[PDB]
């Protein structure tokens, strides 16, 4: 959108990608220079780091790409009849290691009985969930014994209402109306070290719209945030 933001966005891609790349290069050089000083357990572990860090770097490039394909109207949806209960459970599982690395518990509740059959693109809604769940982890409290991110299913106003709730840092009022924009991070002393580009919620907003749905937020600074996603059923 803006231009002052664009130059900040360019410096943030550099910094977010540099972290896995540091691991990749240090691990590879170490294996190469230390072949006689690694046991088999450690060699395999170090190779798995390279692979896992590559997979994280890859996810970040798919974000940049997905963001261009939404800006080019060249992105489209294939709806199906998915069990939403099972889809959330899948997403919750995919984020478990990242959540553990930040001491964040990931919960899933359904207010309604399961299955919750609704007509959606499974790939793209999983990506909506992952972005929200990831943000719950990244923006969790810095030092607290009871950090959580909770996904809540309900059926409402015809469609399905998905809430992603956290007890994280929260979001100031002036920021609430800007967090879904492109290249927009709520700069503050509580976000300084957290990596990102500002595309995750812009992307999530576009995908929710393409389903005919909407997304909004409620937050309290110091307490936490709730992201509401409403998509029609059929």
């Amino acid at each position: 959108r803006i231009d002052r933001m664009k130059t900040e966005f360019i410096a943030n891609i550099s910094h977010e990608l540099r972290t896995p790349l540091t691991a990749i290069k240090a691990y590879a050089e170490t294996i190469y220079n230390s072949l006689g000083e690694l046991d088999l357990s450690t060699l395999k572990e170090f190779l798995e780091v390279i692979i896992d860090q590559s997979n994280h770097l890859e996810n970040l490039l798919n974000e940049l790409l997905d963001f261009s394909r939404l800006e080019r109207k060249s992105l489209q949806i294939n709806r199906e009849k998915v069990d939403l209960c099972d889809l959330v459970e899948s997403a919750v599982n995919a984020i478990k290691e990242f959540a553990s690395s930040h001491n964040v518990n990931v919960l899933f509740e359904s207010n309604v009985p399961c299955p919750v059959e609704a007509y959606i693109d499974p790939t793209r809604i999983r990506q909506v969930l992952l972005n929200l769940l990831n943000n719950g982890v990244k923006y969790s409290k810095k030092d607290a014994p009871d950090k959580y991110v909770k996904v809540i299913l309900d059926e409402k106003d015809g469609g399905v209402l998905i809430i992603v709730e956290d007890n994280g840092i929260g979001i100031p009022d002036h920021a609430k109306d800007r967090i879904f924009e492109q290249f927009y991070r709520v700069d503050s002393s509580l976000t300084y070290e957290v990596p990102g580009t500002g595309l995750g919620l812009a992307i999530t907003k576009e995908i929710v719209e393409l389903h005919g749905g909407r997304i909004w937020v409620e937050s309290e600074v110091g307490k936490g945030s709730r992201f509401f996603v409403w998509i029609p059923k059929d």
């Binding site: 540099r18 691991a23 810095k142």
Partner: protein, 120 residues
Amino acid sequence: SKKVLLVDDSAVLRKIVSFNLKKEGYEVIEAENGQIALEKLSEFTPDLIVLAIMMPVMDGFTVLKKLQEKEEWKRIPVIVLTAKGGEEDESLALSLGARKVMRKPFSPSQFIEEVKHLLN
């Protein structure tokens, strides 16, 4: 022999730098953030501090500042190892009392050369 205090918020980075330090004979104490690091100095005095910048709770610039503001702590050499490789970042860290700023991504062998130099 020599004891190294390694301060970075990435478990993945700590592991590889620790592997390389131990390959030289050094003992390694780890800290996940700047505050935890300052807390560990109550229990020992390192021969060297390897310090990142972007950490939650207490960042590396604050750690460097606080290291200068106590007599016992101010002479411990610090190598800053960081993805913030701008020349101003560097000059701030050196003005804050860092002996050396090394950029990420880094070469493990060059890093170890520098650790060795600072230790001898």
